[PDB]
């Protein structure tokens, strides 16, 4: 009864708009959670003028009002598709889990990183009798200190609503038996990182805070090649690097060009873990706008792109100019693939847009030839179009 | 266990007889006594706080059912010591420490 | 197939034709392990 | 192959063959660390 | 990511070698600030 009264206490000493948000959540958590997941990938006015936006904000600002003082263990069910397991572990009626499917789920979640987002309802105990057990996969996570967790009551039980803004690393999975059915229990960890999903104000603030003292320690030749890379020559450098230079056409002055722009990135590494974004076109995945595969409203297209790229390692021979804002721009509003790179600490690269005078806004650059492992491929709908988000990570 | 001045009561888990799906590990009466009283085992001697509670240094009292079970089981093994019976879920063992011993 | 109408983690065919429990899991009754100590159960699948 | 039927943070083989606790995680019982003071535990894996 | 086993906001190395609190954050004990008024704490990391 203590936790009951504490949850009913927290749910009275808060704003009335927050009460309205949470009460709307008590019935329509589906589309609210979908919005908290896919909200960051629209336009500025699209985000602000959206009706479901503000109450999200409200409920969001409720979550952050109740932080915990010590790490807390939580448990929640999860579908295996959330971890790029595109098949069934066991039918919801079956009771046993095959050794083969277990080993497959093991080898497909061995050492990946899965970024999370949106609202999530969790509990503080293992599910038992009467509890809802929808999926054969149970995640046991440890939330760190200062993590907003709002307890609430759906008129019969108590739940803990949190917002997840981290990436999960599954360590070990085990077979469990609950009430005569076999489940998979996975141990997860939190791998925090820096993120500025839509509020790019904080983003470029931190950027020009950290890299204002960056360019003032460069040689005039490298600053020259950096600024003529910025001002149009980047196209030529990209189609020179992807033209197989160092093996087919050794170009001395362009080799000097590329080595000076590459050394102009390994001087002040990225100081923390960043969540960087980049819209891109079909020409990088062996596709074109006139191909039928680009029509991602086809279930078979999403499935084939998953089978062809999910869990693979892409290698980009040219430089990857990227942005730290999930918001859609008009310069590349026609692109439909969104690569979401995770950059670790002490990584080569730099936020070149610290010095004004560039077309690309909030743009970061990292060394060419660094591979990206794709951990997850999911999709969302911008208006009528179906665009794909590609949770990937820098694998050095 | 009854030292003479104070007693110590213990419950030790044992396996059910007619049950294949009972996985309770099966120990002997000596191992059960050592576990239940934190006794120290030097070589062959079992010691409580300062008292030897060896099978020969104490008096083992049972009820009729336990006395029966132990009597029947002693006939089927060498080294006929009571501290080697298998503790079948219902024993009522009472170790009594003697007041005078040599 | 395996179908659980009453939702008690024992399939219908097992409940109507016979089953036992091994490692906390319901298994279809085979007479061979009548002598290993396992008992045969039947119950209502509704 | 690891397996925890009763879901009590101790694998099945460890419970049915012996284990001990080191830094709050169950480890398989090696006969070496009996002189360090560790004890050997057995339990029901069900 | 430093190791905290018992989940009490103090890492293992700090608990077993010496620590002190500064601005509500546990920091590794340096003997330089013993005269600033800080005290050296030790506790069990389990
Ligand atoms: Ca049934
Ligand atoms: Ca176990
Ligand atoms: Ca600690």
From TrEMBL, chain A:
In this entry, which stretches build a coiled coil? 1-27
User: In the UniProt record, does the keyword NAD occur?
Assistant: no
Binding residues annotated for NAD(+) 3, in chain numbering? 278, 281, 283-284, 318, 335
GO MF terms held by the record: nucleotide binding
Q: Name one Pfam family in it.
A: ADPrib_exo_Tox
Keyword Coiled coil listed: yes
Alphabetized CDD domains for the sequence: VIP2
What residues does the ADP ribosyltransferase domain cover?
1-190, 205-394
Quote the record's binding site residues for NAD(+) 2: 278-279, 284, 318, 335, 363
Q: Which residues bind NADPH?
A: 278-279, 283, 318, 335, 361, 363
The record's section on Gene3D superfamilies has: Toxin ADP-ribosyltransferase, Chain A, domain 1
**Residues of the signal sequence?**
none
Which terms are listed as keywords in the entry? Coiled coil, Nucleotide-binding
Q: Could you say which residues bind NADH here?
A: 278-279, 283-284, 318, 321, 335, 363
GO cellular component terms, alphabetically, are: extracellular region
Q: Where, in this chain's numbering, is NAD(+) 1 bound?
A: 278-279, 283-284, 318, 335, 361
Tell me what this protein is called.
Iota toxin component Ia
- What species is given as this protein's source? Clostridium perfringens
From TrEMBL, chain B:
Q: What is this protein called?
A: Iota toxin component Ib
Q: Which organism is it from?
A: Clostridium perfringens
Q: What is the lineage of its organism?
A: Bacteria, Bacillati, Bacillota, Clostridia, Eubacteriales
């Amino acid at each position: 009864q203590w936790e009951k009264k504490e949850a009913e206490r927290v749910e009275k000493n808060l704003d009335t708009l927050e009460k309205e948000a949470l009460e709307l959540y008590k019935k329509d958590s589906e589309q609210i959670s979908n919005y908290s997941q896919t909200r960051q990938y629209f336009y500025d006015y699209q985000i602000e003028s959206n009706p479901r936006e503000k109450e999200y904000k409200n409920l969001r600002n409720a979550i952050s009002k109740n932080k915990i003082d010590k790490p807390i263990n939580v448990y929640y069910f999860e579908s295996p598709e959330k971890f790029a397991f595109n098949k069934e572990i066991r039918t919801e009626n079956q009771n046993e889990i095959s050794l083969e499917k277990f080993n497959e789920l093991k080898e497909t979640i061995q050492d990946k990183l899965f970024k999370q987002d949106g609202f999530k309802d969790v509990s503080l105990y293992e599910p038992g009798n009467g509890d809802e057990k929808p999926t054969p996969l149970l995640i046991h996570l440890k939330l760190p200190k200062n993590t907003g967790m709002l307890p609430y009551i759906n008129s019969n039980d108590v739940k803990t609503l949190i917002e997840q803004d981290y990436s999960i690393k599954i360590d070990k999975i085990v077979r469990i038996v609950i009430e005569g059915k076999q489940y998979i229990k996975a141990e997860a960890s939190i791998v925090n990182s820096l993120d500025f999903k839509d509020d790019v104000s904080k983003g470029d603030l931190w950027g020009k805070e950290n890299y204002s003292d960056w360019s003032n320690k460069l040689t005039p030749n490298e600053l020259a090649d950096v600024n003529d890379y910025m001002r149009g020559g980047y196209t030529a450098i990209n189609n020179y690097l992807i033209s197989n230079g160092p093996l087919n056409n050794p170009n001395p002055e362009l080799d000097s060009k590329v080595n000076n722009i590459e050394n102009a990135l390994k001087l002040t590494p990225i100081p923390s873990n960043l969540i960087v974004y980049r819209r891109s076109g079909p020409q990088e995945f062996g596709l074109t706008l006139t191909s039928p595969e680009y029509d991602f409203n086809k279930i078979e297209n999403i499935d084939a792109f998953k089978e062809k790229w999910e869990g693979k390692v892409i290698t980009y021979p040219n430089f990857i100019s990227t942005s730290i804002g999930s918001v859609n721009m008009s310069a590349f509003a026609k692109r439909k693939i969104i690569l979401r790179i995770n950059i670790p600490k002490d990584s080569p690269g730099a936020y070149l847009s610290a010095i004004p005078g560039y077309a690309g806004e909030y743009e970061v650059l990292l060394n060419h030839g660094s591979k990206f492992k794709i951990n997850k491929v999911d999709s969302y709908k911008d208006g009528t179009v179906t665009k794909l988000i590609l949770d990937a990570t820098l694998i050095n | 266990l009854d030292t003479g001045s104070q007693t110590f009561e213990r419950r030790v888990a044992a396996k059910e007889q007619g049950n294949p799906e009972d996985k309770t590990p099966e120990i002997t009466i000596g191992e059960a006594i050592k576990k239940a009283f934190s006794a120290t085992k030097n070589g062959e001697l079992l010691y409580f706080n300062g008292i030897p509670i060896d099978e020969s240094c104490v008096e083992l009292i049972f009820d009729d059912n336990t006395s029966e079970i132990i009597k029947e089981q002693l006939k089927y093994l060498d080294d006929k010591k009571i501290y080697n019976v298998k503790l079948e879920r219902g024993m009522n063992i009472l170790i009594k420490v003697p007041s005078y011993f040599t | 197939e395996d179908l659980d109408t009453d939702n008690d983690n024992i399939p219908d065919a097992y409940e109507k034709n016979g089953y036992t429990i091994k490692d906390s899991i319901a298994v279809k009754w085979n007479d061979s392990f009548a002598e290993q100590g396992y008992k045969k159960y039947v119950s209502s699948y509704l």
